[PDB]
Design an enzyme around this catalytic site. Structure first.
Site, PDB file in Angstrom:
ATOM      1  N   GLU B  75      -3.571  -4.626 -21.572  1.00  0.00           N
ATOM      2  CA  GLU B  75      -3.983  -3.445 -21.313  1.00  0.00           C
ATOM      3  C   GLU B  75      -4.687  -3.477 -19.624  1.00  0.00           C
ATOM      4  O   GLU B  75      -5.633  -4.567 -19.653  1.00  0.00           O
ATOM      5  CB  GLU B  75      -4.949  -2.516 -21.895  1.00  0.00           C
ATOM      6  CG  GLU B  75      -5.493  -1.421 -21.554  1.00  0.00           C
ATOM      7  CD  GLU B  75      -6.615  -0.850 -22.141  1.00  0.00           C
ATOM      8  OE1 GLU B  75      -6.759   0.437 -22.109  1.00  0.00           O
ATOM      9  OE2 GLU B  75      -7.447  -1.587 -23.083  1.00  0.00           O
ATOM     10  N   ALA B  80      -6.648  -2.496  -7.683  1.00  0.00           N
ATOM     11  CA  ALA B  80      -6.976  -1.940  -6.513  1.00  0.00           C
ATOM     12  C   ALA B  80      -6.913  -2.746  -5.422  1.00  0.00           C
ATOM     13  O   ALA B  80      -7.693  -4.308  -5.624  1.00  0.00           O
ATOM     14  CB  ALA B  80      -8.348  -1.081  -6.504  1.00  0.00           C
ATOM     15  N   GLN B  86      -5.069  -2.686   2.214  1.00  0.00           N
ATOM     16  CA  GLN B  86      -3.871  -2.021   1.737  1.00  0.00           C
ATOM     17  C   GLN B  86      -2.604  -1.911   2.468  1.00  0.00           C
ATOM     18  O   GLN B  86      -2.493  -2.070   3.762  1.00  0.00           O
ATOM     19  CB  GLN B  86      -4.030  -0.673   1.138  1.00  0.00           C
ATOM     20  CG  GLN B  86      -5.304  -0.603   0.227  1.00  0.00           C
ATOM     21  CD  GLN B  86      -5.734   0.921  -0.251  1.00  0.00           C
ATOM     22  OE1 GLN B  86      -6.327   1.123  -1.109  1.00  0.00           O
ATOM     23  NE2 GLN B  86      -4.831   1.881   0.277  1.00  0.00           N
ATOM     24  N   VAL B  87      -1.462  -1.853   1.575  1.00  0.00           N
ATOM     25  CA  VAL B  87      -0.123  -1.635   2.436  1.00  0.00           C
ATOM     26  C   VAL B  87       0.276  -3.086   3.152  1.00  0.00           C
ATOM     27  O   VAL B  87       0.977  -2.886   4.035  1.00  0.00           O
ATOM     28  CB  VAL B  87       0.122  -0.337   3.073  1.00  0.00           C
ATOM     29  CG1 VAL B  87       1.565  -0.349   3.487  1.00  0.00           C
ATOM     30  CG2 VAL B  87      -0.330   0.698   2.396  1.00  0.00           C
ATOM     31  N   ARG B  88      -0.059  -4.098   2.797  1.00  0.00           N
ATOM     32  CA  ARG B  88       0.114  -5.391   3.277  1.00  0.00           C
ATOM     33  C   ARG B  88       0.965  -6.349   2.448  1.00  0.00           C
ATOM     34  O   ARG B  88       1.185  -7.590   2.717  1.00  0.00           O
ATOM     35  CB  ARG B  88      -1.097  -6.036   3.866  1.00  0.00           C
ATOM     36  CG  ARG B  88      -1.729  -5.425   4.944  1.00  0.00           C
ATOM     37  CD  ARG B  88      -3.171  -6.164   5.209  1.00  0.00           C
ATOM     38  NE  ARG B  88      -3.791  -5.463   6.246  1.00  0.00           N
ATOM     39  CZ  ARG B  88      -3.732  -5.499   7.644  1.00  0.00           C
ATOM     40  NH1 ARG B  88      -2.776  -6.609   8.253  1.00  0.00           N
ATOM     41  NH2 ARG B  88      -4.433  -5.155   8.550  1.00  0.00           N
ATOM     42  N   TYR B  90      -0.518  -7.177  -0.665  1.00  0.00           N
ATOM     43  CA  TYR B  90      -1.231  -7.875  -1.609  1.00  0.00           C
ATOM     44  C   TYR B  90      -1.415  -7.379  -2.995  1.00  0.00           C
ATOM     45  O   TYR B  90      -1.404  -8.117  -3.876  1.00  0.00           O
ATOM     46  CB  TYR B  90      -2.840  -7.477  -1.183  1.00  0.00           C
ATOM     47  CG  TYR B  90      -2.918  -8.420   0.466  1.00  0.00           C
ATOM     48  CD1 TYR B  90      -3.952  -7.907   1.138  1.00  0.00           C
ATOM     49  CD2 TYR B  90      -2.078  -9.192   0.972  1.00  0.00           C
ATOM     50  CE1 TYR B  90      -4.355  -8.460   2.526  1.00  0.00           C
ATOM     51  CE2 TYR B  90      -2.315  -9.933   2.144  1.00  0.00           C
ATOM     52  CZ  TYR B  90      -3.360  -9.486   3.004  1.00  0.00           C
ATOM     53  OH  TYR B  90      -3.368 -10.043   4.236  1.00  0.00           O
ATOM     54  N   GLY B  91      -1.188  -6.061  -3.081  1.00  0.00           N
ATOM     55  CA  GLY B  91      -1.015  -5.567  -4.538  1.00  0.00           C
ATOM     56  C   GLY B  91       0.194  -6.065  -5.157  1.00  0.00           C
ATOM     57  O   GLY B  91       0.314  -6.300  -6.407  1.00  0.00           O
ATOM     58  N   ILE B 119       1.640   6.045  -9.167  1.00  0.00           N
ATOM     59  CA  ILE B 119       2.836   5.647 -10.058  1.00  0.00           C
ATOM     60  C   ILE B 119       4.139   4.985  -9.243  1.00  0.00           C
ATOM     61  O   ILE B 119       4.837   4.326  -9.680  1.00  0.00           O
ATOM     62  CB  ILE B 119       3.386   7.262 -10.477  1.00  0.00           C
ATOM     63  CG1 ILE B 119       2.276   7.730 -11.631  1.00  0.00           C
ATOM     64  CG2 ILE B 119       4.673   6.993 -11.215  1.00  0.00           C
ATOM     65  CD1 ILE B 119       2.658   8.992 -12.162  1.00  0.00           C
ATOM     66  N   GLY B 120       4.130   5.681  -7.827  1.00  0.00           N
ATOM     67  CA  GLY B 120       5.069   5.013  -6.962  1.00  0.00           C
ATOM     68  C   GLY B 120       4.994   3.556  -6.991  1.00  0.00           C
ATOM     69  O   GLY B 120       6.002   2.776  -6.973  1.00  0.00           O
TER      70      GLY B 120
END
Lengths: 6, 163
Positions: B75, B80, B86-88, B90-91, B119-120
Site C-alpha cells: 500500500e 511526493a 518536480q517534473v524532472r 525524479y518521481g 492520477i495522470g
C-alpha cells in the site's frame, strides 16, 4: 486524509 | 547527485532526521492531508519510506508504504517530490526504484488511493483503476483517502526495473 494536492 | 535509501522507524537519529524531512515534504505537497495524520503513518512501525536524496542527505522526494507480505502487495500511503524539483523525472525514477525493491521483496501488487490531481502520473507508471488482484486481499486493510481514487499496479516478476 484529504487527498488533495500540491 | 541523486541517491536512494529505504528508511525505517528504527529509533536512530540518522533515520529520524531523514524521516522528519520527508514528512515535511509530504505535508507541504499535500496541504489537505493533516500533518498529524502524515506523522501517524510515516512514523508507524509498519511503514517504510524510500527517499530521493541530493548530496546524500537533502530529501527532495519519497514514497511511504506498508508491505503486506502474506497478500504480496504494498500500500502506497504517500508519494511526493518537492515542488522545486518536480517534473524532472525524479518521481518516475523513484517509482522504478520502488518497483525494483518490491520485486525483490516478492511483492506482486501496488495499491494506492491516488490523488485526483495526480492520477495522470500514476497511469504513466502503469497503475490502473481496474481491480485485478483478489479484493479480499486488500479490503479492510488499506486506508481510504477522501480525495483519492483507488489505483493498482502489477509488478512484473522478472523484468529489470533499474539495476
Amino acid at each position: 486524509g484529504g487527498k488533495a494536492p500540491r | 547527485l541523486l541517491d536512494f535509501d529505504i528508511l525505517t522507524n528504527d529509533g536512530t537519529h540518522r533515520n529520524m532526521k531523514l524521516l522528519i524531512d520527508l514528512k515535511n515534504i509530504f505535508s507541504r505537497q499535500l496541504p489537505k492531508m493533516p500533518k498529524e495524520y502524515i506523522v501517524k503513518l510515516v512514523f508507524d512501525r509498519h511503514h517504510e519510506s524510500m527517499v530521493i536524496l541530493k548530496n546524500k542527505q537533502k530529501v527532495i522526494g519519497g514514497i511511504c508504504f506498508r508491505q503486506y507480505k502474506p497478500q504480496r502487495f504494498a500500500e502506497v500511503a504517500f508519494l511526493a517530490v518537492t515542488a522545486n524539483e518536480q517534473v524532472r523525472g525524479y518521481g518516475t525514477r523513484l517509482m522504478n526504484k520502488f518497483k525494483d525493491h518490491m520485486q525483490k521483496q516478492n511483492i506482486e501488487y501496488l495499491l494506492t488511493y491516488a490523488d485526483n490531481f495526480a492520477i495522470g502520473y500514476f497511469k504513466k507508471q502503469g497503475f490502473t483503476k481496474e481491480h485485478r488482484m483478489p479484493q479480499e486481499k486488500w479490503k479492510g486493510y488499506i486506508k481510504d483517502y477522501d480525495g483519492g481514487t483507488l489505483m493498482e499496479c502489477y509488478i512484473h516478476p522478472y523484468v529489470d526495473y533499474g539495476r
